[PDB]
Symmetry: D2
Subunit: 286 residues, 4 copies
């Protein structure tokens, strides 16, 4: 409306307005513009996406700055509310506080922080270990301490795969008590566990619709009918982009020319429309 | 021991001709490397457009430098970087060259448009006079290392005709440019006379949706061309793929129909060389 | 609820006159805040010089933006930022304003020099015509929020005389500048006629080693000035102190003679508010 | 000589040439230019300095990017070899590897990494705890794995204050066996412990000459005569700069003008000489 809303308020309103809110991963500002064009009401900056786009595996190598810089580029280009993955907060209480404040300064609408172990030994192997409830509570309190009211903290639990449904609900509920605004859980293997989950935690729940993992793909409607308020598509666009890029590279290498690839390329014209190119080049000219 | 610039010069000498493919980010550069390209490119229009900006000279040294650094962190494959008109006067050009060298960049191209430049394939470009471009080149050559490659790009063809273009190119070589970028030549039969006149290696720009027909690398080489550039080819396909995934999710409430068009986790793991990470930990911490 | 720009406008209205002190970094801004200044300044010459560059328009939006962000992260004290001539054309100026707003900056000043600008106190400045500066201002006003302060700076005095300067300033106000920066006026008696003619608040630049005698804030206010700027004062003393410590260590093999000239750990801890950190941990994790 | 030496080689050579090498802290590029002018042969980027200059306490809040960005600005301005504080490496093996590679890419000559605990619990209080020898060995091996031969890794031990001389020597020796190039220890309370220390570890030893701690100030000559190859002055310049800045701020606030401060300010002329201003403004002019 005519209030000029804060990013967090826009996010909360998008969640309330949609049934459910679909949030799509965008690796850069241009992809966010594409999503906006299609009509999505919220967008997402994946941590794994930030790492992988740098040519790094998703092993917690990236820091606040890697993510912050990708987030800033996106929010500069669109007012569509952005949810940002900040992993485990990048360090202790003061680093978490810095992350929240910097994300808010970057006009980000929401972040999710998770309950994985962060600060393992130097030569410590990759794995799927959870911190205790109390430790995650501390992380949340560090975040809640400095956030504005409108800004959305989503607490993400990875407990489901490891601990089962009951333990997950207990954590999620404790996380809400600590001040989390919403809850991020993996796609439950059984759609009919959602009503119990959503009713227990009270706050809006996000379901993560990842491909090529251990989790099934339900429709947004199905998920909403079972109590879910947000559905996330974290890497979907990016996996298709990579296949397309690879195919173009192979085409050029094999054939000495990109002719066969032409039908698979967005046109200059469509690119110009997404950028509003003509309302620059033409619009203002000597 | 072998500098980026040296690797570039050697790639140019070894290949007939050297295909240089655009990569917008480090992951795309890894894809190109996997396919077996010998040099990669950071497009200025790509830098701008990926930020959601038109290619109108809004971006500065920092926008481009940051994208270049992310790519060279991930690969030793020699990178050619678009630095437009050098981002300002002599001192800015000098800063650009030194920063590009510090970022392990192999080559740059700088062009002879007036400051507020456009795509070389667009109508209504203004050129600086030969003397002014000479000054730009001199500023660059004054601070570059010997191995580092300065490519002088001329946009003169559309505006001044083939003869004037060749004269500029030749003057640019005399001023110390290492190679020539012959932008938006409309006919394969422009190349032999161009390439014979300038002597130094010449790049032909095989961009789509422009003023050039798409000739093969062999055809271009047979006409005296040493480098063929594919500046945005991968990027255009990526955008269409992203858009298609976004439409799928919006229309169908789920990304199932998109799955066949996505790179697999396995292929992603291979391109990131994920297993070398586990390997390294076993190597060092055992 | 109260925007940076609003805090700035209010500081200007409340003080007689508002003293604005240069701070090169966040720690200097904290020192100024401690002393009780109501507004702070990020000098363009300071941005350049601190990088080891001359103040010749080599720096870009990113150099300045990064220094501005570091300061505003540390303090809510309203910050005025030097954006030179806007770093390029209309679209660059628009980007600068939006980025400055995103960085929580309160005010900017933009001047009427030609692109490759110098210190306003140096001989041999070239000015753009009034019309061109008007265009610059319009580009800025078009995208700014209402609260955000655009200060139009004129360097015309040395080149064109007092009368021409006032005419420009007045045209700049008509174009939408909020306040006026009257650079390098040589005599206190230039101010009353200047300030009365332009109406909007006027800043006088009390820089050292320039073309201006150093008048008191009271004297300047009595002549109709609303803001007095001390752009590099702290920075010049810091450099002499650093140099003196370096000479001490080099000459004497030890820094003993320098100890009396060093801030104590205690004072440093107070300015950082170090104890609030321990306090916060006790508050939250008990 | 006429070889064009790598930064690390320049550092090694500076250490070998001097008796001992004095390395002075510089918070920014301009301070590094001042040190170079005075005649120092190596410079230092303090971690505490990076944090404090951001207005942050030295509590491990800063990351690789905060330090990297300050390091890049310095090395852009001078070829004087820079030693950079990278704390405990900013995370596990892969983060350490990234830190080394990025520091090398930034033309840094040397880093020091320490044996403090890093990855404490979220709401975990500030303190002076050491990791076990084995853990630091792992950190060193992570670093040595990716560094170039010439690049200098200095292993820093904080064991002295906590564990005594004997335990410190044992750690230092183990650190050298793991591949550290040099050793950083606090100022030993007894100058005559240095010969034993230096003879046991073999590699060059740095003594840290901090003010206002628990460590005494010996002269460079005294330290060198006892076996020490490097003496560090980490914050000295910066503490004097802060006192000078504060004094200028108080002057302007108290007196309404900076006249009393003038004798304590570096002149425009001296600033111009350090920057080589005249060989820009004059040197190249239309
Ligand atoms: C959402 C996620 O955490 C991410 O890093 O984007 C991933 C999603 C994915 O790529 O499978 C996750 O850890 O599930
Ligand atoms: C090569 C180019 O300079 C670019 O910035 O990618 C462009 C390509 C394009 O617009 O398709 C150009 O100006 O030719
Ligand atoms: C205020 C100023 O614009 C600056 O960039 O600090 C300078 C100050 C100076 O050079 O002393 C100016 O141009 O007046
Ligand atoms: C060298 C040091 O580690 C630093 O962070 O610069 C400090 C020095 C100091 O400021 O006392 C330290 O921890 O001793
Ligand atoms: Cl991965
Ligand atoms: Cl916007
Ligand atoms: Cl920001
Ligand atoms: Cl609840
Ligand atoms: Cl465009
Ligand atoms: Cl590499
Ligand atoms: Cl040549
Ligand atoms: Cl690896
Ligand atoms: Cl200067
Ligand atoms: Cl604050
Ligand atoms: Cl007005
Ligand atoms: Cl605090
Ligand atoms: Cl501290
Ligand atoms: Cl240099
Ligand atoms: Cl770099
Ligand atoms: Cl030994
Ligand atoms: Mg993630
Ligand atoms: Mg371009
Ligand atoms: Mg200035
Ligand atoms: Mg430190």
């Amino acid at each position: 409306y005519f209030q000029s809303m804060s990013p967090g308020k826009l996010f909360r309103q998008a969640v309330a307005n949609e049934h459910p809110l679909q949030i799509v991963g965008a690796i850069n500002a241009y992809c966010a513009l594409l999503a906006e064009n299609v009509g999505f009401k919220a967008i997402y900056l994946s941590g794994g996406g930030v790492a992988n786009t740098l040519g790094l595996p998703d092993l917690g190598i990236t820091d606040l700055h890697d993510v912050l810089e990708d987030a800033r580029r996106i929010t500069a280009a669109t007012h569509l509310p952005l949810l940002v993955d900040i992993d485990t907060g990048f360090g202790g209480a003061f680093t978490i506080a810095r992350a929240i404040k910097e994300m808010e300064r970057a006009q980000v609408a929401a972040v999710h922080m998770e309950d994985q172990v962060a600060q393992k030994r130097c030569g410590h192997r990759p794995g799927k270990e959870l911190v205790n409830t109390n430790e995650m509570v501390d992380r949340i309190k560090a975040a809640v301490d400095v956030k504005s009211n409108d800004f959305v903290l989503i607490a993400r639990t990875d407990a489901y795969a490891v601990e089962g449904l009951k333990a997950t609900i207990d954590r999620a509920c404790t996380y809400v008590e600590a001040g989390a605004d919403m809850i991020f859980a993996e796609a439950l293997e059984n759609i009919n566990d959602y009503p119990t989950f959503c009713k227990a935690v009270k706050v809006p729940v996000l379901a993560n619709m990842t491909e090529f993992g251990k989790t099934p793909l339900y429709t947004a409607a199905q998920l909403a009918d079972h109590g879910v308020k947000m559905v996330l598509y974290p890497r979907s666009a990016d996996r298709a982009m990579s296949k397309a890029a690879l195919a173009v590279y192979e085409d050029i290498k094999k054939h000495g020319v990109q002719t066969a690839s032409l039908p698979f390329m967005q046109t200059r014209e469509a690119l110009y429309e997404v950028l509003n190119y003509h309302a620059y080049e033409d619009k203002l000219n000597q």
